[PDB]
Design a protein around this ligand. Structure first.
Ligand SMILES: *[C@@H]1O[C@H](CO)[C@@H](O)[C@H](O)[C@H]1NC(C)=O
Ligand SMILES: *[C@@H]1O[C@H](CO)[C@@H](O)[C@H](O)[C@H]1NC(C)=O
Ligand SMILES: *[C@@H]1O[C@H](CO)[C@@H](O)[C@H](O)[C@H]1NC(C)=O
Lengths: 139, 216, 211, 137, 137, 216, 213, 212, 215
């Protein structure tokens, strides 16, 4: 059996949406077509089983409602659901202050399930090298 | 950092001819869905203008004669039929990683037939000699292609390091170039020699042409 | 539609700073990253980027000590400050909007920054004195900064004129020639005068060129 | 050999610095070779290498909030494996901040891991905010 | 095939932005197919996929504090794989904050990973606060 | 969200009878150690009261006759021997995930023998006609069980939906229900017709009873 | 004894807001999550959200996230829910309830009734429902707002055989109810029957004799 | 050179607090962790805790977490240790010491003696210890506070065979020691033996003739 | 916490003799590259001084005659040839985990031949006894080795809890110890008894010696 893993890099978007966008570029991972990055916004797995799923988000803001990042799951035939969430209060630094969140855990996925990351303010996400990323590996 | 090398450095074409230029990256810039390579046009005095994004997508408002293709390390831009406004320099640019980098450019130049230069030499004015420097100017006029060798000789000694060249852009009427080479010496160094010669080598000339004068 | 208007040209001494501006209109300024890009008299280089929404920046390692990037959102303007200027910073500098931090889809007109020890100085103008065709010209020597303009017979004579790009001499001063080819026949019948203008020093020389 | 993994969901308690957990919602408990015991610890039957993690979101106002992943092995005193420590927010009524801890450790048969915090009443228990798990390599 | 994993403990130093580590306390070093070299990097013998992580706790008083997981591969220039930031606390004498980084990467034989920070003197070294590790998938 | 469906909607029992009610969840709400299902009693005008927590644990102070059982998707509450204070509505609720949700309830009702309604019809008062409206009232008195159908007929034309019903709670002395149905017409509509009839169907009656009057 | 005491009933117009209180006693207020739960007319129970009184952290049902703001005053051991942008569909009894472990709901407030309606206060008209061996008679108590109305018979001397029905909300936005009594037919020409109807909100008191024909 | 200089001895009552200082010189104060270490009378060494002078971050031995507060003043290159709710068991020499990499302890302060005691400063009572071929004699120097006492014999003319014992802390909370000398038995009628006791803290100087 | 046990408690050697002392840890304190064990010297009244770091590295400025070895749970410090300045107590210390802990120490003592004590007994002075206290002092003078049993008898009855001992450091000229045992009693306690005896047991004596007085 092949190893199944993905690591994708953050991508900015002028688009109007809380869903973060990603790209297969730089020092990324995509071991085979058994995980795919779909529509720049979700990692989709072909095979059922246990996966370790993670995301890290750096954002730069000034401010208060927290900045919240959510790892979400869409399974075939099911409504979307939140798997993990992390918060950080906004910095007072000018012009903005950077803060980071890391999320990760083990979850059972169904064939064709997709995971994605949502945030309170996508325009505040830091996209400099290494700051923001999303991945998974099959156990 | 990623290095982009474009070929050729200069591509000579006519209107109504197909032009293809290439761009080779030092590493792959393609993955499963996208190639992170873009192409630009720039004319002198103007900013670059985006033509093609992600290897093959025509930017909004760019004419249909522009197309792009490639993957991995190798990308091409094609103009299906050149039009007079297309003569310009073209750059490729990746967005694979930080920093984005550009190729060195390909100049799309107007093809015409070989034309020999007319060569002319000018002694320094007495007026400039009066101020203490001697500039001697060799003019190569209305030639094609651009490649030309100008060698200065002073009583038959080949000069080195004491001249500068300047070249015009292709003439709007005849598509030719002109070139000046200026030899600069002090009054003292200049007045110590008799014969000043400009030797010109160009494929238009059946052998090199030398224009010269004697100080007096 | 989408437009980026940059500030005017700078001519400064080594060790100075300049602060360049880039005014944006015709789109939502906060929705797109702004890049800055250098093009030296001799090649395109990306300097860095700013997110206008929050002022977050990233830099090319080559420019990190040199460039400071800010925005004023209220004014839709991005700024770039260049410090410890040296002659090797002489360049055209562009702002350009980026779509998704990938391609650069609209560009400012560019701002020329020239850095030099040299002080303003008008040119000396010298004759380049004259087959069936003859050449003559004017050598426009030892001026700073660019540009000069040359015309011939106060713009009566354009045909066969070639005004070459200036060269920077090791002295820090510019030089160029302007030449014209005419019938050898005409060297008695018609007079030839070159009109040199150098606005920075407000110099204007009219030089008759003859045998 | 079976896959051995657990992922459990935060649970409030009126009781202790030790956080409580529950097998509910979108949890993982692959088999009886790992168990959630007394609502407070994950206990593994098999020796070996495990990746062990915890995620804690807390909401406080105003000394830092500290979360500790701890180990109790048979015949040994408990020990700290990992800790993360964040200053309190001044947001009102409280400000949310999150801590993530994780690393690879050799466990003995019957070892248990648990998570302690400086103030368990400040922990955020909304969906997905606070969780604890492990996987056997 | 053997299991390949490492977990090392932060070490203070007089020296550099590069953090130092040690194999002491409750560490992991499964075999010589991963080694801690010069107290500063984890070097792997075998190509393949690894999950790599670091967590750094720092104590500062108020430019952000930035931690970077870096890769040096044979014949290549070093590069950044992951970075995390946090603004400086305003607590006196200092306020603790933690950052956690981790992800799955392809490594080449003899590649080394290390962690850099903006001010290593501000790193918290108390038990469990700061650590670095990896595991081969 | 999780859906909880309770059965039966109404359970009729006497004191001294065992009562068992059930709650089916749209997904499992049990894991290794616990079931996240709880049960409540509620009387009209009062808050719910917790009876059983985590499927089978008797809440502190709750009498021993209450018990619960079940796992996965299916849970039951049993009252071993009903007492008069137990007639109430009972709700299940899970705590598996956000939001907690409740079932639709099971009414524990006092069982008695079938009793037919006494049926009465009331014309609108002259007071009320003057003011421009006619309310016609049909009364079904002291019947059991609760299910009854009242149809209004105006010159034999079956009416809808120009009536509203109201039902009392079980009477404290005889455990019966009473029901009013009110037909509302404008004065103009009322004066256009002669025979106003209320037809009542109930299992206590050998056939439907129709009570009526002629306007006049 | 653990006890939760809620604030009194509200009658408000659409677009209004109300702020409900829930005073806790008999336990450490900060040690338990407080839930708020809605129960509509003839209705089932719906969880609105929760607050941690220790820090003010909240979580909501998606259905109510726009409608409800939850706060506490630790010093007063009181939890508050503000409901905003009220519409008739928000008419319900609203409960606070203590949660043990955010699982079961082990102590409940008595409930606060919130009625939202564009109707204005209005006293009822009282119309007679005029009368085999048993006769029925009654009073139709029509077109009032808000609830409640009370009805007695012969000043409370007549209780046996009385049924006073739940009010129905008419599509006018006004309420109506009937009260009836059954009596021996043979009593219709000795006994007088008078309904005593009271609507406190409008200061309306009616004593209506109900007579044969 | 690298140097740590600690503050003077403290003599204190149960319940008081003291704040000890440790001034660092000859190296970059902020580049090295400072440790504090306790050594009780007759005892070995116990690590109390550590501070990072660059930011004031600290970590403690659990045994001293409620006893010790560590601070620094960077501009003064000084580390400070505050001890509170002092009891007689806190009597010890307290050292600051620089740590290389929080491993070894490469440079040490001279130590600060902290004595915690009910007793008040008090000069000693001085008593004779009077009389084979060799005789022993001495002075019993009793019930003084704090340490130390100095003892010479015949104004330092007599040093040979002198033994001055380390003090014993008595159940009274005061110190006692003897100073003893052996001399020829035949000298006892002719040589005079005088112990010269000096207790610098109380300015007490007692000379006592020891006679048979 | 890790317990470090040093052996022997006291090591007796001459200048010009090799000394090795050992330190056993309750768990291993070595890994792939380093051992986290360090050694110090301490003299009375002075701070400890670092000698050896990470088991075997001589600290800068420390003389070459010092060396250390070992791994896992067991470490040794060796002085190749002892010099007079080396007489002191030596401690090992680990840095494996928090808290660092030290061994209980090894005293390097100056070896010399056995010497029996001269034993003397002193009655309480009259000056002291009339102020309500009676110290009786027993002196053991210039003996070696340091181990000595001193027993007090009052009318043939063994005393307990009412004496303290003090011992000198090794004498600079002859390397012996001396010891005082001081038996304290009230004036009244003392006057109720006649024969006060100090019994001394030491390997230098062929049998125990008793020195006593009356009254
Ligand atoms: C994530 O954000 C999108 C809006 O861009 C929304 O449709 C979606 O519901 C969000 N998903 C979750 C689970 O919050
Ligand atoms: C965690 O907290 C519990 C008490 O709430 C305490 O007994 C235990 O020592 C703590 N464990 C550790 C390793 O800190
Ligand atoms: C990490 O820090 C060192 C110096 O301390 C520096 O040489 C190196 O470039 C840094 N590496 C990266 C990838 O930032």
């Amino acid at each position: 059996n092949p190893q199944i893993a993905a690591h994708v890099i953050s991508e900015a978007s002028s688009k109007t949406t809380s869903v973060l966008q990603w790209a297969e570029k730089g020092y990324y991972t995509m071991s085979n077509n058994l995980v795919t990055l779909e529509n720049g916004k979700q990692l989709t797995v072909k095979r059922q089983g246990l996966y370790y799923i993670y995301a890290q988000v750096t954002f730069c803001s000034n401010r208060q409602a927290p900045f919240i990042a959510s790892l979400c799951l869409k399974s075939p035939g099911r409504f979307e659901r939140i798997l993990l969430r992390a918060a950080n209060t906004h910095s007072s630094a000018k012009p903005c202050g950077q803060q980071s969140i890391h999320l990760g855990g083990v979850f059972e996925l169904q064939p064709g399930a997709s995971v994605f990351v949502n945030v309170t303010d996508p325009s505040q996400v830091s996209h400099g090298t290494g700051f923001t990323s999303f991945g998974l590996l099959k156990l | 950092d990623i290095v982009l090398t474009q070929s050729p450095a200069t591509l000579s074409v006519s209107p109504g001819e197909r032009a293809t230029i290439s761009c080779r990256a030092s590493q792959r810039v393609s993955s499963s869905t996208y190639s992170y390579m873009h192409w630009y046009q720039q004319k002198p005095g103007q900013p670059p203008k985006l033509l093609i994004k992600y290897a093959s997508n025509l930017e909004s408002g760019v004419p249909a004669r522009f197309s792009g293709s490639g993957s991995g390390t190798d990308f091409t831009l094609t103009i299906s039929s050149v039009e007079p406004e297309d003569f310009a320099t073209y750059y490729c640019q990746h967005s694979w990683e930080x920093p984005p980098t550009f190729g060195g450019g390909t100049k799309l130049e107007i093809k015409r037939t070989v034309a020999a230069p007319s060569v002319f030499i000018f002694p320094p004015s007495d007026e400039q000699l009066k101020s203490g420097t001697a500039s001697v100017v060799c003019l190569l006029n209305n030639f094609y292609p651009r490649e030309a060798k100008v060698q200065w000789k002073v009583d038959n000694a080949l000069q080195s390091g004491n001249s500068q060249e300047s070249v015009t852009e292709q003439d709007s009427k005849d598509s030719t170039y002109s070139l000046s080479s200026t030899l600069t010496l002090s009054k003292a160094d200049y007045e110590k020699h008799k014969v000043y010669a400009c030797e010109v080598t160009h494929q238009g000339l059946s052998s090199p042409v030398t224009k010269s004068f004697n100080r007096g | 539609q989408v437009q980026l208007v940059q500030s005017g040209a700078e001519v400064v001494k080594p060790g100075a700073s300049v602060k360049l501006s880039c005014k944006a209109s015709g789109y939502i300024f906060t929705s797109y990253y702004m890049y800055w890009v250098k093009q030296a008299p001799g090649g395109l280089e990306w300097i860095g980027e700013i997110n206008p929404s929050n002022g977050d920046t990233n830099f090319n390692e080559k420019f990190k000590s040199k460039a400071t990037l800010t925005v004023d959102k209220s004014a839709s303007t991005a700024y770039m400050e260049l410090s410890s200027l040296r002659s090797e910073d002489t360049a055209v500098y562009y702002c350009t909007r980026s779509d998704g931090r990938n391609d650069m889809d609209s560009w400012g007109q560019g701002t020329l920054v020239t850095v030099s020890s040299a002080s303003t100085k008008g040119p000396s103008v010298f004759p380049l004195a004259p087959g069936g065709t003859a050449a003559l010209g004017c050598l426009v020597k030892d001026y700073f900064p660019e540009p000069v303009t040359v015309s011939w017979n106060s713009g009566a004579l354009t045909s066969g004129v070639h005004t070459f790009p200036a060269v920077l001499q090791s002295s820090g001063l510019y030089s160029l020639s302007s030449v014209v080819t005419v019938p050898s026949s005409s060297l008695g019948t018609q007079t030839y005068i070159c009109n040199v203008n150098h606005k920075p020093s407000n110099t204007k020389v009219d030089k008759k060129v003859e045998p």
